[PDB]
Amino acid sequence: MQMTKEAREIIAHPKGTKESRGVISLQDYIVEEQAMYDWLFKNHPIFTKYGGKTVGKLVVKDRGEEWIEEGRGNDFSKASKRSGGEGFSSMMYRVARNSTLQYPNKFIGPEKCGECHPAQYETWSRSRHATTIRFPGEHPEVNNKLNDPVFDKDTASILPQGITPDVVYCTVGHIRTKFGFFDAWLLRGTYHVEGGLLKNGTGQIVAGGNQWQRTWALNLSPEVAKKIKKWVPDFPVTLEEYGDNGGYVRGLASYAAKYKKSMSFQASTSYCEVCHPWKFDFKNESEFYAALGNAKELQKHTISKGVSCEECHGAGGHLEGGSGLLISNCERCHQRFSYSPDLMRNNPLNAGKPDLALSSKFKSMGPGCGSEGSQTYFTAHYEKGMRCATCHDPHDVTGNVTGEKGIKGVSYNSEQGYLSSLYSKPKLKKECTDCHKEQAYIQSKADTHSKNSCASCHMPFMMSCENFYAIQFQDQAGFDTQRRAHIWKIDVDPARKSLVAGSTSKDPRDGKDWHFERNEEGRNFVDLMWACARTTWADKDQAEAKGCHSPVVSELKETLHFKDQKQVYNEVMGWQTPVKDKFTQVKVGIQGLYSLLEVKKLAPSDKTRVYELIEKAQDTVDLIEKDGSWGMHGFKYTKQRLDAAVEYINEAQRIMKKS
Amino acid sequence: MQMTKEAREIIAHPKGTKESRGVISLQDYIVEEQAMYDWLFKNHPIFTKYGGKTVGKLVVKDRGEEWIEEGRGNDFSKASKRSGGEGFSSMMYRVARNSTLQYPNKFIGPEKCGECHPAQYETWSRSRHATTIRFPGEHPEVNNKLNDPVFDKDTASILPQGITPDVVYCTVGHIRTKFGFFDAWLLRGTYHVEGGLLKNGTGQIVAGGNQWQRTWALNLSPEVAKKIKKWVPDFPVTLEEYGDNGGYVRGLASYAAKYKKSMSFQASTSYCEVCHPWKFDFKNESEFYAALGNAKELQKHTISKGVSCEECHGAGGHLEGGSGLLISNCERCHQRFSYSPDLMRNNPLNAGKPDLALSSKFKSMGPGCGSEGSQTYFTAHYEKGMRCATCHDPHDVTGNVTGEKGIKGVSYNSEQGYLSSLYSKPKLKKECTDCHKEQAYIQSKADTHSKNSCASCHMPFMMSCENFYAIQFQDQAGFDTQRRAHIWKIDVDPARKSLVAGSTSKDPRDGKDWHFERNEEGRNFVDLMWACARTTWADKDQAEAKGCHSPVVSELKETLHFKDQKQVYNEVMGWQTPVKDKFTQVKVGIQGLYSLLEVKKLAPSDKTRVYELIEKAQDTVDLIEKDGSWGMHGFKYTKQRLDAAVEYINEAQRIMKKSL
Amino acid sequence: MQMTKEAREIIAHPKGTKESRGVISLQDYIVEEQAMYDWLFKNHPIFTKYGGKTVGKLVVKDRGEEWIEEGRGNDFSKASKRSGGEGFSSMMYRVARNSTLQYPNKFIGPEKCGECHPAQYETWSRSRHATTIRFPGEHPEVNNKLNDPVFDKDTASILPQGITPDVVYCTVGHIRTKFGFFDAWLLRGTYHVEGGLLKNGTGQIVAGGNQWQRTWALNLSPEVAKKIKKWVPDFPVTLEEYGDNGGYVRGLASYAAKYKKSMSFQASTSYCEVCHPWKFDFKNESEFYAALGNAKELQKHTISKGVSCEECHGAGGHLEGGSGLLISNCERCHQRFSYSPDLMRNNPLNAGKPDLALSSKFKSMGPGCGSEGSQTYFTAHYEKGMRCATCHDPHDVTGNVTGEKGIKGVSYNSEQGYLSSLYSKPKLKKECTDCHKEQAYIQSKADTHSKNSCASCHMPFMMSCENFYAIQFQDQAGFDTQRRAHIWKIDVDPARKSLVAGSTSKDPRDGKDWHFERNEEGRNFVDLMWACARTTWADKDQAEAKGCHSPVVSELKETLHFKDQKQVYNEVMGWQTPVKDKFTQVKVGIQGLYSLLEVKKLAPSDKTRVYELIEKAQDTVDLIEKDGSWGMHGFKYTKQRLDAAVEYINEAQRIMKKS
Ligand code: HEM
Ligand SMILES: [Cu+]
Ligand SMILES: [Cu+]
Ligand SMILES: [Cu+]
């Protein structure tokens, strides 16, 4: 057992700044983790109780790999002029302030910020930022039964087999999408126990079957899976067909682990403390390591859980003795840059500019949760100065969502506010209609999609939280679809996809180097299958609008179930072709007449009329060009205006003739 | 004599973070005040020279009550899941950085920021932020006569009877609204001395008669009071009629005190250092306590006065050795939340969300000064991400206001720029017209209110700075009206009021738990009485527009003096009803015609014409809908466009008729 | 040799705050410099090897003069109530954080910020902020030949006579405009050496001939000069006619010096560290003074060069052990206020308000480079809350600019991206057309200037980077024109000038107290000569649009070469006068028809028609009024459109006739 080679090379020859400059920087964080892994190798029960034997190999994954190697950081580093191409690049995972390995820290806890800022405490406290980290006893949404089935009695409990609350420090997550756990040794829970209990050192440690997944447990029954299989012939139906991604019961999937084959061995320090953090109140590291291995002692000494005030604003915020106030830009946890060699090779003028080949973290073939920032970085919105806080309230990030009263589960409790909810409804400072007036105007007119939100087409749930690759069939715009894309640009095309395999991929399902495609303007885009026909169980708008056009969840008539991108493109063109044809005629007419007002004299009263008509026709052209949807924001009204405008041009042309 | 019970409990069982974490938090600030109060109980003249005897009882009011109990902080705390409902909530009064009890501090003074930032120093220095704290010798606007009448010889001086400059550390405030003072022991001036001078230990300490009020001393003469009384029969005229709120001479009211009945005993450290601060340059606390009681010594060692650069930006700003730069969001001094159990009770959807039952500090029955933030918090503006500095320049907060040459006073001096002025004109980055273009366009059409500013209707002076409850008659939108409401939304209703009494109120004027009402969108709103017919002497726009529709100050004909809200509402309906009616006709016509074009056959040029007409009508409807005032921004223009649009629709119907 | 009197006075009676308060402030910076000047008076080669003898007088200029006296700080101070009118005002030059005289510092260098922020590193690293300070060996754009001619073999090399790379700490600047150098003793390069080499202490120190200038070396050949001479009689053609401003070869001018007459003696600490900084990693001031005089040692210990992350964001940024995160408002280096007594005197409503009499730094008769801030301060834009970061990306400040392949040069290499480029194209978040919609609409119509940017008219290159006063003829809008004015408001007048001499000026070219004029709204403005007819070689838009109307560089026909402002004004009237005529005609008509409508009875159909026509004409009027250019944004569309509105009025009249 040892740390990753990358970590060991840095430990052997470190070039941090803590000792030389008195300022901590990337390499210092890599170095400081050595003692934690030494401790775990001697003290974790996998070794003390199970003799280092597991069903599946242990694969150590420390900061050396996560904070340096992920997102092809080493390839990015080589493509950069920084440090002569010999440097390191932390693409996805890193902290801005001290890690949980430094004691003492200056955290005072959110309740103390709340004494003076009760208003923000209240909104923050009813958000998933506040409860992403929770202890046993803090799950009223499952009546505090972490080991009983949540929904149907043949589906999974939140905790895996053999894992009981007394050896769990915390759960991570929510009913919203999924849960994970950390054991009392603060080791990421990538395993379960068969034929025994971790608590007693009995049975066997088995890789995988460690991650509770709401959609698989609740929505994705074998019956639903058979329905998908009619359309997608290789969709897995039985548990065994979920393979390495699955496990022993539906709802508990293998994550950072392949069922019975391999499992990551990872401290919270290496990864999870970047985005689902906690802080302890210990005065020094001796106190910390003494408690390490007892959940109750660690819980009692926990001064901050989850994404609290001070995770965003800094320890002690602006207070005297604190570490200095920050205003988060969200990129610690919501950015997730991933360098793509394929995007780099699109243009020779990219030489020395590898930032132009950044994409987003992908979980196998889907863009990963927490990648909204790397998505928005290649949008017109980001170019125009817009950031997360432009649109989002940074405190009330969950909104007034509630549980599902029609769900009859063995443990599920629908009455616990947002904790019971399958959805998110973040509080917004800006709606699309605030900035896009012409689009709002046309889309407000009574028509096919006028009831739907702008976000319903423009912000599909493309993102994978669970890395449930066994159900990722991305050309069918499903089925591992749990977070919302922040791309906005919709591409209208019969074939071009948003998501593409890397050129290193040797099998269409191996998931190698997937990335977002870039359009002609160098921007990310949403293809029409995602925009119109995606299948998801995370999207409240979709569920309130008859499942949109998904062959799996649509309640529309079968001819409006969109089964491939070309079909969707055909529907779009049914509206766009007639709009563009009339649009062109009108503009052709407007020039036909403007120019021909030099080659003819008219009775002043006819001249007035011709001017008047083409001026009104020009108003319609401008509105439609500015709208830019070519009828997709409202065919009926767009056609009404274009019909009028061609009448104007014909009336004017009739007049010009009589001369 | 002792500190409040709330402070003593926290001192007895403190749960701050200074010792356990090395970070100062709320409870540490409560604890640190113990020494100051012990000192005051032994060393203040009230005790050393007057035997602790005062006319009216002494009421200690330290941070334990001000920073913990105010705004029903304890009820908010019990309504919250935070700390199992057993925590504390500082609703209004707290600091962000060290208080004036820490020595040494890192303040260098605004003149030092000004060495490198001369431009911002200049604009800041000509603002009331810069001069809210002043020493004797810094009042040219009264020819430095703090003890002679400011205006008429029968009205008040700035300092009350028995209080002389040499025992005053500072004055607080301006001619703008009011003044207060702090004695050389840094105790808040809630008293005067009858038959003697404080400096000689003679006479008697008497509660109240301590706050100079411009509006009472200048504008609210017995003559004006009598005029008001014809409308409002209970309105006080004689000095005796102002009761506990008054005192011994028109212009000096009792504030944080009741004349001869009670007076707050309060160090500057408990309350005033939050919003009207100063900082001293002492190396340690021994030096500070040694200077205490000596105005000249304290003044000499004052390194920052009032809302200086570093009060906003932190002590030493971004400089090496400083405390770290801050950009103020203004909530230290301009927010003032107050929790309203009635707003919780009346909306059951707010259960477990005490933040949605937040209101503003009320001074009796009017929202307090410095509550703009708690007001804006419940507006569309704040919801769209707008904050104070969206609209406001943070430095030039007073603007180019001047005195009134027409005022002849015993001491008043009109030539001192903003210091002489009765008004405020903060420099703005954004005007209403920058974001509300349709409203601006219609409003620019010459009519009844074309010379009104947008803020004249939308931002009435509803706020009470002085807590002059004796003249607060909120249903008549007067008469203690010194600061500008930041609410904007105008409600259109015959009876519904912006301001209402709490359910604890047992008498229409007892002033218990008054608060803002919330509309169907969960927002604050301005009722039509405030928007149209309010009475104030702090609103220059109103003074320059014939006093608007106030029965008391309107110069308009008597038929345009609005005596109550139903009368205003009926005037509004007279404009909105015709507009709304015609708007509805035009909108139905447009849609009806569009629908009929889908089936009824017309010659090409008729179809052309019908389309053309309904598109023109649609332009008009879109404009008027987007404006959303239904004629209140420009009645004749609005109805004219709609009358023209009605003509377009009728011609279009004429064409449809021919076919049949 | 000694420090300036202003410095010595402060040193004698210091009222800083470091000792009393523990906080560094302005006067502390002045005092701290004393050791450096003592050291230079004893150790610089000028004294140790040349015996204090120079061709031209040594003029010491320290922080005492730069940070205190510049911009008429003492007059501003006296005009202010601050400190009784007896204090100091640092108008242009000061730092926010420790100077380069304090050791150790907390800088970790931009490559360490880049480890975690690879994206911002990439865009920042290809900007002139990043390379404004460079060491010998880092000039691929002249093939690293600092002593060979850049362009033609009879024009200048970057380094002057007798100055070799081995005794130069760094160069300042780029091909873009100009270069400068610092010797190994960190003295500002205001001299060269005739008859020997500085490294051997041979030859004589000669004042001036020290600043390499791109425009003089490349563009302003004797032929071009002759051409300008035909329009401007006094224009210098021969090297000798450039006088004190010139030197011994075309391309190397005298700056902070007069050729063979005077040269400033200035440490980097007094001035250049404000805006073109660097930082050393020295652990104390002893290590620093020990390396002084050795270019290689200093270079080896340089941890930050130029305007790096930490110069804007503070040393160590937000990192633990750092000095605390900043977000720069750019005023350290781009503001440059200069108090103008003339502006104060010429408006007695500004009495007691010297801030309102602030102008910008002028380099002789042109506004200085890095005065964008003091310029925008008196604009509508600043008043509305706009700041540098409203329009600009703060990282990607240079943009995708490239060299010129057509240039023949002895050393010039045109293939090093932005390093080879003569232009700047800063990345913007907002374009003029984002906020100014009506102007954008009119300007989009195919017409005379429709291909041109808004910035082309509104932001001419008025600013002097080089103080090349020998070619400054401002009434002719030329010819020392290297940076872009940030004023936007164009004044339309036959004679009023943006740039005027101070009342202390005696000769029209003595360059005394020049300043911007203020218009009737208290704002800076651009006169029509600058807007339309200016001569520059720094403006890419101008170069891509036939040199605009410069008599010197225009490729237009000769009737479109504008020689004076009166001629420009007249061309503007050619357009605005017909537009305002028709405009007024329409307003009169609308008002007339409207007044008649209440006393006139019309058939329902006739009335419909008159309202409608009036209403169309009103829309046109509103658009033209909103545009506010009266044809300057597109004469053809504007005039055509007003003509039609006249027709609407005329048709309305024909219907009103039936009364
Ligand atoms: C889309 C590009 C442009 C934008 C957004 C823009 C914007 C503006 C604005 C906002 C004004 C002020 C109008 C007022 O006072 O109400 C203006 C005036 C002016 N612009 Fe432009 N402009 C553009 C292009 C141009 C061009 C190409 C030229 C010259 C060829 C030009 C020359 C002027 C002049 C001379 C004025 C002064 C008008 C007067 O005061 O009479 N502009 N422009
Ligand atoms: Cu996730
Ligand atoms: Cu007040
Ligand atoms: Cu320059």
Give the list of residues 6+ apart from residue B491 with CB closer than 8 angstroms, or none: B498, B519, B525, B526, B527, B528
> Are B108 and B289 in contact, with CB atoms under 8 Å apart?
no
Burial class (CB in 10 A: 0-12, 13-18, 19+), C276: buried
**The total number of residues written for chain B in this structure:** 660
The whole-angstrom separation of Cα A651 and Cα A590 is: 12
Whether C638 is in the pocket of ligand 1, judged by its Cβ within 6 Å, is: no
CA of B236 to the centre of ligand 1 (A): 60
Q: Which atom of ligand 1 is nearest to the CA of C432?
A: 5
Give the list of residues 6+ apart from residue C521 with CB closer than 8 angstroms, or none: none
Q: In C174-327, which ranges are E strands?
A: 179-183, 191-194, 204-207, 211-212, 252-253, 257-258, 262-265, 278-280, 302-305
B25: nearest CB among A115, A434, A643 = A115
B186 to chain A nearest CA, in Å? Answer: 24
> Are C653 and C592 in contact, with CB atoms under 8 Å apart?
no
Nearest to C469 by CA among C483, C479, C482: C479
Cα separation values, A20 from A11, B446, B578, C296, C299, Å = 16, 72, 79, 21, 18
Report the phi/psi class of residue B413: left, alpha or beta, with left for phi > 0 and alpha for psi in -120 to 50.
Answer: beta
The whole-angstrom separation of Cα B433 and Cα B453 is: 10
Cβ of residue A320 closer than 8 Å to a chain B Cβ: yes
3-state SS, residue B245:
helix
Nearest to C383 by CA among A385, B396, B328, B435: B396
- The tokens of B460 are what? 């009435």
Cβ of residue C337 closer than 8 Å to a chain B Cβ: yes
- How many Cβ atoms sit within 10 Å of the Cβ of residue A349? 11
Cβ of residue B88 closer than 8 Å to a chain A Cβ: yes
- Which chain C residue lies closest to B122 (C-alpha atoms)? C355
| C13 labelled ligand-binding | no
Q: At what angle do helices A565-596 and A604-627 cross, to 10 degrees?
A: 150
Q: Tell me what percent of chain A is helix, strand and coil, each rounded to the nearest 5.
A: 40, 10, 45
Q: Which atom of ligand 1 is nearest to the CA of C528?
A: 35
Cβ distance of A119 and B25 shorter than 8 Å: no
Query: For the residues of A169-195, what is the DSSP string, one character each?
Result: EEEEE-TTSEEEEEETT-BB--EEEES
B118: nearest CB among C27, C76, C96 = C76
| A561 labelled ligand-binding | no
The whole-angstrom separation of Cα B397 and Cα B483 is: 14
User: What are residue B21's phi and psi, to 5 degrees?
Assistant: -125, -10
Cβ distance of A651 and B605 shorter than 8 Å: yes
> Are C366 and C474 in contact, with CB atoms under 8 Å apart?
yes
Any idea which residue has 């991604």 for tokens? A245
Q: What element of type H or E holds A499?
A: strand A499-500
What are residue B172's DSSP bridge partners? Answer: B133, B180
Q: What element of type H or E holds A27?
A: helix A26-32
The whole-angstrom separation of Cα A649 and Cα A614 is: 6
Residue type, B319: L
> Are A512 and A403 in contact, with CB atoms under 8 Å apart?
no
Whether C522 is in the pocket of ligand 1, judged by its Cβ within 6 Å, is: no
> Are C435 and C527 in contact, with CB atoms under 8 Å apart?
no
Cβ of residue B377 closer than 8 Å to a chain A Cβ: yes
Query: For the residues of C254-289, what is the DSSP string, one character each?
Result: -SSEETTTEEEE-BGGGTHHHHS-EEE--SSHHHHH
The whole-angstrom separation of Cα C587 and Cα C595 is: 12
The whole-angstrom separation of Cα C482 and Cα C436 is: 27
Q: In C24-68, which ranges are E strands?
A: 54-55, 57-60
**Which residues of chain B neighbour A108 with C-beta distances below 8 Å?**
17, 21, 23, 25
The answer for C 568-597 residues in CB contact with B (under 8 A) is none
> Are C460 and C438 in contact, with CB atoms under 8 Å apart?
no
CA of A464 to the centre of ligand 2 (A): 7
Whether C398 is in the pocket of ligand 1, judged by its Cβ within 6 Å, is: no
Nearest to A257 by CA among A182, A170, A191, A187: A191
- The tokens of A563 are what? 């089964």
3-state SS, residue C291:
helix
Sign of the CA dihedral with B410 first, then B415, B419, and B423 last: positive
Q: Which atom of ligand 1 is nearest to the CA of C443?
A: 1
Helices marked H in A545-599 — which ranges?
565-596
CA of C633 to the centre of ligand 1 (A): 6
Give the list of residues 6+ apart from residue C196 with CB closer than 8 angstroms, or none: C162, C202, C203, C204
Cβ of residue C281 closer than 8 Å to a chain A Cβ: yes
**The total number of residues written for chain C in this structure:** 659
CA of A265 to the centre of ligand 2 (A): 19
Query: For the residues of A437-492, what is the DSSP string, one character each?
Result: HHHHHHHTSSSTTTTS-HHHHHS---BBSS--GGG-BGGGTBS---B-----PBP-
The whole-angstrom separation of Cα B418 and Cα B409 is: 17
3-state SS, residue A365:
coil
**Which residues of chain C neighbour A326 with C-beta distances below 8 Å?**
318, 325
Cα separation values, C244 from B619, C59, C255, C362, C478, Å = 68, 16, 10, 19, 20
- The tokens of C333 are what? 């280096």
Whether C580 is in the pocket of ligand 1, judged by its Cβ within 6 Å, is: no
Nearest to A98 by CA among B96, C322, C97: C322
Cβ of residue C126 closer than 8 Å to a chain A Cβ: yes
Whether C633 is in the pocket of ligand 1, judged by its Cβ within 6 Å, is: yes
Any idea which residue has 């080493």 for tokens? A74
Burial class (CB in 10 A: 0-12, 13-18, 19+), C71: buried
The whole-angstrom separation of Cα B519 and Cα B72 is: 22
- How many Cβ atoms sit within 10 Å of the Cβ of residue C237? 16
- The tokens of A503 are what? 């050129």
- Kindly list the partner chains of chain C, i.e. chains with 3 or more CB atom pairs below 8 Å: A, B
Whether C388 is in the pocket of ligand 1, judged by its Cβ within 6 Å, is: no
3-state SS, residue B219:
helix
* Nearest ligand, CA A173: 2
Pick the residue of B106, B313, B319, B430 with the most C CBs within 10 A to test the interface with C by mutation. B319
The whole-angstrom separation of Cα A409 and Cα A416 is: 14
> Are A244 and A261 in contact, with CB atoms under 8 Å apart?
yes
Nearest to C375 by CA among C523, C504, C478: C523
Residue A47 C-beta-side C-alpha neighbours within 13 Å: 13
The whole-angstrom separation of Cα B646 and Cα B581 is: 11
Q: At what angle do helices C565-599 and C604-627 cross, to 10 degrees?
A: 160
The whole-angstrom separation of Cα B378 and Cα B359 is: 9
* Nearest ligand, CA A128: 2
User: What are residue A182's phi and psi, to 5 degrees?
Assistant: -115, 135
Nearest to B422 by CA among B452, B456, B465: B465
Cβ of residue A140 closer than 8 Å to a chain C Cβ: no
Q: Which atom of ligand 1 is nearest to the CA of C442?
A: 1
In the 8-state DSSP scheme, what is residue A102?
A: S
In the 8-state DSSP scheme, what is residue A17?
A: S
Helices marked H in B44-189 — which ranges?
45-48, 63-66, 73-79, 110-116, 118-125, 128-131
Pairing type for strands B366-367 and B362-363 reads: antiparallel
3-state SS, residue C464:
strand
Q: Is the peptide bond before C136 cis (omega within 30 degrees of 0)?
A: no
Sign of the CA dihedral with C626 first, then C631, C632, and C637 last: positive
| B13 labelled ligand-binding | no
What are residue A360's DSSP bridge partners? Answer: A337
* Nearest ligand, CA C272: 4
**The total number of residues written for chain A in this structure:** 659
| B318 labelled ligand-binding | yes
Q: At what angle do helices C635-656 and C565-599 cross, to 10 degrees?
A: 20
Whether C545 is in the pocket of ligand 1, judged by its Cβ within 6 Å, is: no
Cβ distance of A111 and B80 shorter than 8 Å: no
The whole-angstrom separation of Cα B200 and Cα B211 is: 22
Radius of gyration (Cα) for chain B, nearest Å? 28
Where b means 16+ CB within 10 Å and e means fewer, B207-236 reads: bbbbbbbbbbbbbbbeebbeebeebbeebb
Nearest to B362 by CA among B515, B534, B524, B523: B515
What are residue A211's DSSP bridge partners? Answer: A253
A318: nearest CB among B17, B326, B383 = B326
- Most distant CA pair in chain A, distance: 103
